């Protein structure tokens, strides 16, 4: 494949945490 598929997945998987990480439980 474009191999960029794995790269993007990581990129999103990096931001996904950042979003949730943005909001703190307490």
UniProtKB/Swiss-Prot annotation:
What changing residue 4 to A does, per the record, is: Strongly impairs sporulation, but does not affect localization
According to its record, what are the GO cellular component terms?
membrane
In the record, the effect of residue 2 to A is given as:
Strongly impairs sporulation, but does not affect localization
Protein localization: Forespore outer membrane
Q: Which UniProt keywords apply?
A: Membrane, Sporulation
Its membrane topology? Peripheral membrane protein
Phenotype upon changing residue 3 to A? Causes mislocalization and strongly impairs sporulation. Does not affect membrane association
The reply to whether Acetylation figures as a keyword in the UniProt entry is: no
Q: How does it assemble?
A: Interacts with SpoIVA. May interact with the ATP-dependent protease FtsH.
What does the function comment of this entry state?
Answer: Coordinates cortex and coat assembly during sporulation. Associates with the spore coat protein SpoIVA and with the outer forespore membrane, thereby serving as a membrane anchor that tethers SpoIVA and the entire spore coat to the forespore surface. May also serve as a competitive inhibitor of FtsH activity during sporulation.
User: Per the record, what about its domains?
Assistant: Residues in the N-terminal region are required for proper localization.
Q: What is this protein called?
A: Stage V sporulation protein M
Please report the organism this UniProt entry assigns to the protein.
Bacillus subtilis (strain 168)
Please name the gene that encodes this protein. spoVM
